[PDB]
Amino acid sequence: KEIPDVLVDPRTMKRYMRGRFLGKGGFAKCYEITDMDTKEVFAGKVVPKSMLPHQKEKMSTEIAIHKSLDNPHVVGFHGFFEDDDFVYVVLEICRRRSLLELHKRRKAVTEPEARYFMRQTIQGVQYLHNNRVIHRDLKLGNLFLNDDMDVKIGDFGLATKIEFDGERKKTLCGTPNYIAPEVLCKKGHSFEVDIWSLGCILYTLLVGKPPFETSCLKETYIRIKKNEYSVPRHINPVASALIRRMLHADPTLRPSVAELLTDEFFTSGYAPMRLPTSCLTVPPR
Ligand SMILES: Nc1ncnc2c1ncn2[C@@H]1O[C@H](COP(=O)(O)OP(=O)(O)O)[C@@H](O)[C@H]1O
């Protein structure tokens, strides 16, 4: 099979010129796409129908969740369509890869950087929770970056919208390093699983590795359910205090999203409003 050079849909009847390769992942291949008449640039997720009513239901709910979203810290959803072979998701273009690639090249980042990255990310998470959306898959590889180094939360493939007040979800899903203990135990979970994952993100940024990172997958899960981790003594007491709270065994003792923004960690030290593109490879001066 070969993905068409011009992407056309029955609905909008727009044409997208398939350009440069951006990356691949969970049964999807992303390309830089340009509307041939207005010259607007987007990211086009192209997924084969051979990869797909069981898997097709999990994608159609992702689209429905992502479509209803509009926020400066969330990857913009600009439309979806399918021909006879491929499903085309049209997204906001994020040319600065993800926070995972920054992490691999940089290792532990500086304190002001984590303030910037976490703040923008939490502002996105707050928006999601205000609209009753639980992401459930928050990690460095899902926090995308644009040319201005703005964080863009993406991939809502494991996301869920809640309707009634005290709904508790039961699906066991996520990424090993970031999955909340209540999700592994399958007892039931809600909004505070995103706070846990955020705590894993903050730890990883300041320390240089995930808190429950192990060579064995089975061990990692045991560490999480037993709440077995340690923040190194070299980390600022304020940041470690916040990390300990976000990674609490009891979901009800974790800070709310609103409580995160007004934390001492975000109000004490230097918090830059902008980060240069040099942060992708070297520490900022
Ligand atoms: N909105 C986007 N803008 C630019 N590139 C993207 C975007 N979303 C995904 N990509 C590219 O696709 C790769 C994997 O992304 P991911 O979202 O994990 O794939 P999937 O859509 O299968 O979940 C990344 O390396 C990234 O370069």
Q: What is the domain range of residue 90?
A: 11-97
**How far, in Å, are 24, 127, 181, 185, 199 from residue 141 at the CA level?**
12, 20, 21, 25, 15
Same domain, 40 and 136: no
Number of compact structural domains in the chain: 2
Residue 6 lies in a domain: no
Same domain, 71 and 169: no
How far, rounded to the nearest angstrom, does the alpha carbon of residue 197 sit from its chain's CA centroid? 10
Q: Measured between alpha carbons, how far is 104 from 113 in angstroms, rounded to an integer?
A: 15
Do 132 and 172 belong together in one domain? Answer: yes
State whether 140 and 188 are in the same domain. Answer: yes
Residue 147 inside a domain? The answer is: yes
Q: Assess whether 124 and 189 both reside in one domain.
A: yes
155 three-class SS: coil
SS3 assignment, position 271: coil
The one-character DSSP state at 268 is S
To one decimal place, what's the resolution in Å?
A: 2.6
Same domain (yes/no): 138, 118: yes
Give the other-Cβ count within 10 Å of 151's Cβ: 26
Q: Is residue 2 part of a domain?
A: no
Phi, psi angles (nearest 5°) of residue 70: -150, 105
* CATH, residue 84: 3.30.200.20
Structural domain contains residue 87: yes
Measured CA to CA, the distance from residue 153 to residue 52 in angstroms comes to 24
Q: Which two tokens stand for residue 265?
A: 């960690």
Determine whether the annotation assigns residue 173 to a binding site: no
Q: Are 106 and 242 contained in the same domain?
A: yes
Position 275 in a domain = no
H/E stretch holding 30: strand 29-35
**Ligand 1 atom at minimum distance from 89 CA:** 21
Whether residue 140 is found in the same domain as residue 214: yes
Whether residue 271 contacts residue 251, with contact meaning beta carbons closer than 8 Å, is answered with no
**From ligand 1's centre to the CA of 10, what distance in Å?**
25
Measured CA to CA, the distance from residue 270 to residue 282 in angstroms comes to: 18
| Rounded CA separation 200/219 (Å) | 17
Between the CA of 269 and the centroid of ligand 1 the distance, in Å, is 33
Are 113 and 246 part of one and the same domain?
A: yes
CB neighbourhood size of 168 (10 A): 10
Cβ of residue 155 lying under 6 Å from some atom of ligand 1: yes
Position 4 in a domain = no
At residue 266, the 3 state secondary structure works out as: helix
Q: How far apart are CA 283 and CA 113, in angstroms?
A: 9
* Chosen domain end from 47, 82, 97: 97
State the method: X-ray
Q: Ligand 1 atom 3: the closest Cα is on which residue?
A: 94
> Do both 46 and 130 map to the same domain?
no
Domain edge (last residue) among 81, 97, 113: 97
